[PDB]
Design a protein around this ligand. Structure first.
Ligand code: HEM
Length: 381
């Protein structure tokens, strides 16, 4: 078993191998740094199975020395649950966290988006979209979706930023301040029905605050990167920026085509566990063996997509895996699209003379994460 990761993904590209195996119709076996060897799925068909098939448990690695990447062991989160606990827990949260409820935020997003622009270009010459726009937009929208008082939208932020750049005694101090402030908020909503109110309706207080902290994590630093990384990719392919400044009616299907093509992690997912013998790619991953997935190789499979390694805003359908598949599919999906749609949309519309302030090859990324994130994205206009 050839060791994994294959190469520290510097910048935003992928190691050839993944696509090599997809096409080989080969299921990879790799040696992860911690825990042991794992299997590795790269095909759309075989990444679809691991997302949706019930022969693969996410439960079965809580408290375990499982084929992993970071030494720390994972601490029961929703994304580490199987049916029917997961299903009862998702079934409830879906009744509060609605696709409607999320479309309902588009007018606010416009405000914070279009006034985040106002400020940014109202300041200096060159800017840093990351600190001036890509990072603030999603926390502000997270807050607004929780119905956090705008008088604490900053104090709050400051707490979510110190989850690193902050001392150990003031990491947990932040978390505990966020946990105790987020229960009190749910306490001051039980007497009244928005998202936190709707959540109180069968969920335990423990699961209620749990979820509120999860959404913060699941969709803050991820949504930042999507906005950041997309702008980047769009500026290094203007044939396709231009295609969006001519008509903005495209941006929905664009957001999804940018989601397909940009890698969401620097490497393969947390591993799932086979709870019964399964065939993937002609191999019998036996019960107990572990399988990690690559969404990118699935998101550019020629057996599923035409001209995969090419952008195209007219794709009939777009069954990408950047936002998950089946039971555990991203329950921000709608908010994400909303955020990203209005984020890029105005951004483009407002400032159609946008460009890098530096030679792209010179635009640096970070070494100390699992998701690809720009260290800074300086621009001009
Ligand atoms: C902006 C880019 C985002 C991307 C690319 C993204 C991607 C994903 C992916 C790939 C999963 C797969 C879970 C899995 O099957 O392992 C997922 C799950 C999830 N995401 Fe997101 N997400 C984003 C933003 C958000 C936001 C903004 C929220 C909440 C406000 C959110 C909440 C969740 C939740 C709760 C799950 C777990 C659902 C479950 O386990 O049933 N995400 N997301």
């Amino acid at each position: 078993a050839c060791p994994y990761p294959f190469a520290e993904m510097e910048r935003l590209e992928i190691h050839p191998e993944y696509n090599r195996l997809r096409d080989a119709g080969e299921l990879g076996r790799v040696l992860m740094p911690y825990g042991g060897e794992t299997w590795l799925a790269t095909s759309w068909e075989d990444v679809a199975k691991v997302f949706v098939d019930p022969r693969f448990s996410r439960s079965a690695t809580l408290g375990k020395d499982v084929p992993r990447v970071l030494p720390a062991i994972q601490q029961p989160v929703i994304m580490l649950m199987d049916p029917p606990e997961h299903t009862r827990l998702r079934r409830l949260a879906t009744k509060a966290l609605t696709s409607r409820r999320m479309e309902a935020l588009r007018p606010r997003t416009q405000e914070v988006a279009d006034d985040l622009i106002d400020k940014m270009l109202a300041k200096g010459a060159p800017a840093d979209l990351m600190e001036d726009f890509a990072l603030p937009l999603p926390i502000i929208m997270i807050c607004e979706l929780l119905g956090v008082p705008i008088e604490d939208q900053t104090k709050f932020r400051t707490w979510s930023d110190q989850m690193g750049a902050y001392s150990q005694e003031v990491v947990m101090a932040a978390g505990q301040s966020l946990y105790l402030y987020l229960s009190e908020l749910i306490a001051e909503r039980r007497k009244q029905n928005d998202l936190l109110g709707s959540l109180v309706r069968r969920l335990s207080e423990t699961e209620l605050v749990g979820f509120a902290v999860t959404l913060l994590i699941a969709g803050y630093e991820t949504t930042a990167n999507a906005i950041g990384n997309s702008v980047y990719t769009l500026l290094t392919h203007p044939e396709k920026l231009a295609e969006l400044r001519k008509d903005l009616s495209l941006i929905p299907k664009a957001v999804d085509e940018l989601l397909r093509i940009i890698p969401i992690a620097k490497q393969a997912s947390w591993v799932r566990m086979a709870v019964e013998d399964v065939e993937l790619s002609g191999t019998i991953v036996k019960a107990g063996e572990a399988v990690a997935i690559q969404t990118h190789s699935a998101n550019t499979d020629p057996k599923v997509y035409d001209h995969p390694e090419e952008i195209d805003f007219h794709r009939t359908s777009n069954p990408h895996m950047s936002l998950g598949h089946g039971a555990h599919h991203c329950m921000g999906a709608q908010l994400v699209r909303v955020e990203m749609q209005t984020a890029l949309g105005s951004l483009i519309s407002r400032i159609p003379a946008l460009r890098f302030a530096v030679p792209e090859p010179r635009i640096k990324f970070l070494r100390g994460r699992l998701v690809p994130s720009l260290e800074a994205l300086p621009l001009t206009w």
